[PDB]
Symmetry: C3
C-alpha cells in the first residue's frame, strides 16, 4: 500500500487486517404504526383510574413531539415547498428531514383513514389494508403482556391486584420510554433516529419490527449494528395515542478505491527503555489520499468497516509523513504498564520485542537474542522455522520484505505524553519557554 509498512513495523505498528469502506445509501421507506396504549377492553372491569392517569401522563410526553412535527407540517406546502420565514432557524439536516416528512405525509394521510381500525386492534402485531395494494402493520405495546398475563388471571386473583399489576406495567413501560421519547427528543424532525431507539415504544422489539416488515438481505445484521436503519416519526395522535413511523432501510455501497488499514501496536526497545508509538491505529486510504477515520462510530468486522455516514477526518502533514516513511516524525510514548503487547504476527512473520519477552527457537534450542541497538526482531523461517514464546509455539513463514531487516536500523521519533493533565503541563511549559524565546 501507500504506507511504508517495512519502516512502520520497526517502531511497532505491525500491519493488520485490510478492510474495505462501506457507507449506507439509497434507503427504501416503509410506514408502520406503533400504538403506545394497549387495548384493555377485556380487563376493563377493574382498570380503575389507571388508564385515565396513564393517558394523562402520556399526553404530556406526546404533545411536544406533535407540536414540533406540526411546526414543519404547517410551514410546508406545494409550490416540496418550505417557508423559511416561519421556520426561522434550521439546519440542513432539519430541512432535509422536513422534506422527508412532507413526502411521508402523503402516506400518513392514507394511514390515518383507518383510525377506528387502529383503535380496535387487540393484538401485539396486526395487519391492516391501507389501500388495495399497500399493507400497514400496527404494533401495540404491552398488548401481548395483557393477553397472556392479565386476561387469563382475572378471576383467579383479587383483581385489585390486577389493577396494581396493570399500573406497574404501564409505569415500567413509561420508565423505559422516557429516556428516548422524553424531553431528550427535542428534534423529532430528523431521520438519524435509529430503529432500536424507536422500538422503545414497542418495548425494544426492533427484531419483531424488522422481521414483520419483511426486510430480508445479506447485510441485515451489518446495517442493524452500524446504526444505518433509521426511523422517523411523521404523525402523532393524542386521541388514539399512536405514532406513525417511517423506517428507512438502505443498502451498503462499497466505496471504490477505498480501504481501511489497521496497524497493530507493539512495544519496542530504545535507549534501554520500552516504548509504544502514538499513531492512528486505523488509517483510511481513499485513492492516494491518507486521512483519519473515527471508527468508534462505525461497525468493524473482519472484512469491512461499515458506517452510516462518512467519518473521515483530517490528518496532519507530520503524521502523514510518519505513515509514509519518515519514522522520525512518529511520536512515541514510554511504557510503564506490564499489560502491553510485545509481539504480533503478520503474514506468517513474527515481530517481537525479544528484550521484554523471552524468544527461544525450538528447531535449534538456542535463545533468540536482541541487541540493545535493535527496536524489534523480525523472525521468519529463514532465521529459524519455529519460535517458542513461553507456552506458545508458532511455525513461521518467510518475510517478503528486505533480507537485511534485522541489520538495517532506523530513527525514532520524539517522546510524547497523551494524558490530559500531561498535555496541559506540556502546553504550559512550552508557553513559559516561548515567552522567553519571543
Amino acid at each position: 500500500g501507500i504506507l511504508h509498512y517495512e519502516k512502520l513495523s520497526k517502531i511497532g505498528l505491525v500491519k493488520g487486517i485490510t478492510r474495505k469502506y462501506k457507507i449506507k445509501s439509497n434507503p427504501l421507506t416503509k410506514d408502520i404504526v406503533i400504538k403506545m396504549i394497549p387495548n384493555v377492553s377485556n380487563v376493563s372491569k377493574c382498570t380503575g383510574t389507571v388508564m385515565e392517569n396513564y393517558k394523562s401522563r402520556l399526553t404530556g410526553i406526546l404533545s411536544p413531539i406533535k407540536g414540533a412535527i406540526e411546526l414543519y407540517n404547517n410551514n410546508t406546502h406545494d409550490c416540496v415547498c418550505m417557508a423559511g420565514i416561519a421556520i426561522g432557524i434550521a439546519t440542513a439536516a432539519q430541512i432535509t428531514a422536513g422534506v422527508a416528512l412532507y413526502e411521508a405525509m402523503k402516506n400518513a394521510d392514507n394511514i390515518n383513514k383507518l383510525k377506528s381500525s387502529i383503535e380496535s386492534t387487540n393484538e401485539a402485531v396486526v395487519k391492516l389494508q391501507e389501500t388495495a395494494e399497500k399493507t400497514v402493520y400496527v404494533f401495540t405495546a404491552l398488548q401481548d403482556y395483557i393477553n397472556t398475563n392479565l386476561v387469563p388471571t382475572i378471576d383467579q386473583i383479587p383483581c385489585k391486584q390486577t389493577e396494581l399489576a396493570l399500573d406497574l406495567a404501564l409505569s415500567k413501560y413509561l420508565s423505559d420510554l422516557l429516556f428516548v421519547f422524553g424531553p431528550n427528543l427535542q428534534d423529532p424532525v430528523s431521520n438519524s433516529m435509529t430503529i432500536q431507539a424507536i422500538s422503545q415504544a414497542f418495548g425494544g422489539n426492533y427484531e419483531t419490527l424488522l422481521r414483520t416488515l419483511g426486510y430480508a438481505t445479506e447485510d441485515f445484521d451489518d446495517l442493524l449494528e452500524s446504526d444505518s436503519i433509521a426511523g422517523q416519526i411523521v404523525y402523532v395522535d393524542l386521541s388514539s395515542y399512536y405514532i406513525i413511523v417511517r423506517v428507512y432501510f438502505p443498502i451498503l455501497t462499497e466505496i471504490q478505491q477505498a480501504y481501511v488499514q489497521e496497524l497493530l501496536p507493539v512495544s519496542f526497545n530504545n535507549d534501554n527503555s520500552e516504548w509504544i508509538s502514538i499513531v492512528p491505529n486505523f488509517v483510511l486510504i481513499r485513492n492516494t489520499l491518507i486521512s483519519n477515520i473515527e471508527v468508534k462510530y462505525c461497525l468493524i468486522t473482519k472484512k469491512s468497516v461499515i458506517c452510516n455516514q462518512d467519518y473521515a477526518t483530517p490528518m496532519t502533514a507530520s503524521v502523514r509523513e510518519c505513515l509514509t516513511g519518515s519514522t522520525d516524525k512518529c511520536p512515541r510514548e514510554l511504557v510503564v504498564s506490564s499489560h502491553v503487547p510485545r509481539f504480533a504476527l503478520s503474514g506468517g512473520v513474527l515481530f517481537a520485542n525479544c528484550i521484554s519477552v523471552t524468544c527461544q527457537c525450538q528447531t535449534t534450542g538456542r535463545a533468540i537474542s536482541q541487541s540493545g541497538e535493535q527496536t524489534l526482531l523480525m523472525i521468519d523461517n529463514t532465521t529459524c522455522t519455529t519460535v517458542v514464546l513461553g507456552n506458545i509455539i508458532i511455525s513461521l513463514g518467510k518475510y517478503l520484505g528486505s533480507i537485511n531487516y534485522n541489520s538495517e536500523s532506523i530513527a525514532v521519533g520524539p517522546p510524547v505524553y497523551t494524558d490530559k493533565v500531561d498535555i496541559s503541563s506540556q502546553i504550559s511549559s512550552m508557553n513559559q519557554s516561548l515567552q522567553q524565546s519571543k
Copy 2:
C-alpha cells in the same frame, strides 16, 4: 447579543436557538421505604433454601452500605454537630450529605417504629401511617411478579419448577441491582444519586415511585431528564432487608440575565478548499460575561438548557475575541468528510456554501454563483425570493444586517487539527522547533 453574529456567520457559525439557563434549587424532601426482599408467605410451600441463599447474598451487598452510613451516624451529635477527628477524611459534598443524613435520621427513627408492618407487606405498593399526619410508602421488589405469576400457578406446574422460577427471578433482580448498589456504591452518604439509579432496587420503576409520591409539576419531565431528582439512602436494615430513601424534589430557577447561545457550524470555502470552524457550539452568556458550558451533562430543549448544577467552564481570551469579532483568532479545520453541513437557515435567511452545493433561484431561473474570494453567500429575498437546493425549495425573508454582506470580506483564522494523535504530533513538532530556537 454580545457576540458578533455577522462576522461569526461569515466563517460558517450561523446563529441558532437562544435558550435560557435553568439550574435546580430548593429541594423538598420525602421519605420512602424500599423492601429489597419480597413476601413469599403464599408460595412458602416450596421456596426451599432459595430464600436463605438470597438473604445471605443480599446481606453481603447491603452490609458495606450500612457500615458507611453508620460511619457518619456514629460521628454526628447535637452539641448538626460533626466530629471531624473521627471522620478523618471527607469532602465538602460528603460533609453536606452527612448533615442531610442527620436531618433525615429524625424521620427515619419514626419510620423504623413500623418495622413489623414493613415486614408484613404483601403488595408492591402499600401505604403506612408513620404518624397521625405523615404517610410513608413501602415499595416491595418482585412482589407483583410473585402475586401475579407464582401464586396463580402453585397447583398447576410441578412446584419444583416454581422454586427454580423464584430463584431465577431473585438472581435476575440481583443482576440488575449489582451495577448500582454493588461495590461501585462506595459513597452512600451523598445526595447526587439520581432517583432512576435508586429505582433499580424496585426494578427500575421510578415512574411508579414518583407517581405514588405525588409530585405534580409542569417541570416534572425536565427535572427527571436533567438528573435533578435525587435520592439518598439514610437507613439500611439487615434483619428485614429494606432501605429508607429520602427523595429530593427541587424546582428549576431561571438564572437572571443568563442565556445559552447555539452556533450552527457551516462549511465555508477558502483557498480553493473547504473548512469548518473549531469553536464552542454552545456559549453561555451571564450578564456580559462569556464562558463555556458543558452541555453534555445538561438537558437541552428548544426553550432552555436545564442542568442539575452550574456547568460553566472558563474560556480563553483568544476564543472570546473570536466570538466578539476577531475572526482571525478563530481556529478552523479542513473538511474531508462528505457528510458535514453546507448550509443553514437563520431568521428566514439562508447562509450557504454555493461552491460545494448547487444554489439556483426559482424566481429567475439562474444559478446563484459564489466567487473564490467569498467564504459564504447570504441569500435573502432582496437578492431573490426563492432559492432551490436540489430537492429543497425555500422561501426566504429580508436580512437585518449589513446590505453589503456579500461585498464585504473578512480574515480567516489559523488552521488546526483536533485529533488526539494530531494534537500530540503538533505539540512534539512545536517543542522540537522551540528547542531548536533555544
Copy 3:
C-alpha cells in the same frame, strides 16, 4: 508519602484516602453450556413456523462465530503448536486466546459427547455428568419463561396468541442478544469479554450462572465489578444451537509496595480570583516510582483500587515535580462555576477557602478571616476547636505538619484552560508566535 502533601494542600490538593493496588491473576477455569434455543416440546402444538424462522435467524448470528473459532481450531495441533502461515495476522492477545482455546477443546470434546442430553434439556438449569467425576451445567434461555407462562396457559387462551407470544419472546431475546453476539463480536477468540456480556445469551443472569457454578469467595463482588471474571466461547453447535463457554475465575493479587493516592481538589484564592489545580486526582505510587493510572477502567472502593489489568500510564517530569514539591510547575485553572468545592477535611483538619465561604468559630464567636495573600487556611483546634461553615459545625483535630503553615506562603503555577477548543486555540496561538519568532 513521596508526595509533598503540605505544599499540595496549600494549592488546594488535599490528601484523600490511600488505597492499595490489586490486579486479578491466576484464573481457574470452569466449563458451562448455554443452550440458545428453548425446548418447546410441550407447546409444540402451535409453535408453527416460528421455531423454524428463529432457527434460521439464529444460524446467521452463530455461523460467523463458529467460523472464526474453527479458523484457530484448524491451525492448532499437538505437535500448543500454532501454524503462523495459515493464521496470517494476529496479535499477542489473539494468539494467547488461541492457546487457551486449544486447551479448552480437550474438555469441549468430552462435553460434546452429551449432545443428545443437551438437546433433551427441558429446564433452565440442569446438571449433566460429563465424566465420572466432572459435572457440566446447561443453561437454557427462555426455558423458565416457557415453563411458567406458556405451558400453564396452553388451553386457556386461543393458542394462536401463544404462538405470537412465543414469537415475541424469541425476538425480544434476540434483540438483547444482538448487541453482544452480533457483528460487533468480530473476535470470539479472546478471553477479555466479561461474564456479564456472556450472560446475555442467558437473559443477563450472570448471578444465576456464577451461583450455580458455586464460585464462593470474599472478593466475589470485587471481581465482578472490576470486570475480572471473563468467559470465552470455545465451541458453537449449529445443529443443536448451543455454545460452550469457559469461565475464568481469577484471584485478586495485592501489588507489593504499591498504593493509589487520591487528592481532593479545593478551590484557592490568588490575585483576587478563584482557581483550581489541574493535576491527576489519582496517583499510583509503585515503590518510589510515581505514575498516572486510568482509574475509570478500574473498580474503586474505600480500601483498594481493583483492576483487571495494569492501567499504569506515564507521567511528565513537570507533573512529577509538581507532585514532589515544585508547586510552580502545577497547572491551575480559573473558577467560574458556583458548584465547585471550597473546603475539605483531612486528618481532622479543615482546609478551606475562607474568602469564598464564610468561616466562623463557635468557640470564640469571631469570624475566621483569610487575607488576600493566602491561598487557603488550615483550621485545626490549635487555631480554634470548632469551626462553623453555614449549617455545618465541625470539631477539629490537630495538624501534624508545620506550625507556621498559615504564615508560610508558596508560589503558584501557570494558568491553563482544559477545554478542547481552548487547547486547539492555545496551540494555534503558540504556533503563530513560534513562527513569528522564526
